[PDB]
Amino acid sequence: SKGSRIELGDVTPHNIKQLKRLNQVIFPVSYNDKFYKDVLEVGELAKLAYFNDIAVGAVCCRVDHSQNQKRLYIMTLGCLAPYRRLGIGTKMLNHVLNICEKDGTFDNIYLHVQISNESAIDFYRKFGFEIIETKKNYYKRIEPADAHVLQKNLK
Numbered sequence: 001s002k003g004s005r006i007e008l009g010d011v012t013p014h015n016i017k018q019l020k021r022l023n024q025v026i027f028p029v030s031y032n033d034k035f036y037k038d039v040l041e042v043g044e045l046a047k048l049a050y051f052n053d054i055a056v057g058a059v060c061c062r063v064d065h066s067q068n069q070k071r072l073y074i075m076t077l078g079c080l081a082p083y084r085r086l087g088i089g090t091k092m093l094n095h096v097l098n099i100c101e102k103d104g105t106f107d108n109i110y111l112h113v114q115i116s117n118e119s120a121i122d123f124y125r126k127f128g129f130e131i132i133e134t135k136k137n138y139y140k141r142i143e144p145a146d147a148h149v150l151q152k153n154l155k
């Protein structure tokens with residue numbers, strides 16, 4: 001962490017415009033105004049990521065109670081293409097893993113990855129996420145439509 005050029009910051013009504021902008025470039029699915037209203041309310045579960053004080057990424061999560069578990073759902077975690085492989089993803093994922101660890105009541109953390117997202121699969125598997133399912137036709141508008149469900153067990 002020391003000397004690091006990467007820093008995470010809070011999402012606020014002041015920089016939320018910048019979050020949406022980042023998400024529009026990085027992620028193939030569009031998020032509605034509800035998404036953005038909700039992110040302003042999850043506190044530490046939404047962050048902007050900065051490299052040399054430039055906003056280049058963001059992570060947005062939600063608490064999920066499904067399958068009789070308490071789950072952390074990563075809805076978006078990503079950064080701008082020219083800044084990849086610099087540790088920014090790791091900083092964002094470690095931020096969320098650290099919250100779950102301090103809280104202690106989460107059963108797992110999971111997310112959906114388009115089957116073509118080789119680099120995302122590589123990234124999450126490095127941290128102990130596993131493909132636990134491939135959902136056919138998960139995505140409505142993009143090709144390919146299928147998504148892997150990646151999950152890391154915490155319990």
Ligand SMILES: CC(C)(COP(=O)(O)OP(=O)(O)OC[C@H]1O[C@@H](n2cnc3c(N)ncnc32)[C@H](O)[C@@H]1OP(=O)(O)O)[C@@H](O)C(=O)NCCC(=O)NCCS
Nearest residue numbers: 077078079084085086087088089090117119120122123126
């Ligand atoms: C997936 C993503 C978040 C990774 O972020 P990042 O900052 O590049 O990740 P990091 O620099 O912390 O790298 C983490 C480790 O993951 C693995 N990894 C990450 N990207 C990889 C790639 N393209 N190919 C192979 N391994 C990769 C590596 O082991 C890497 O460590 P290393 O650089 O020492 O080899 C990034 O590629 C991204 O923003 N993707 C677009 C958004 C997306 O699809 N995210 C998934 C949800 S839909």
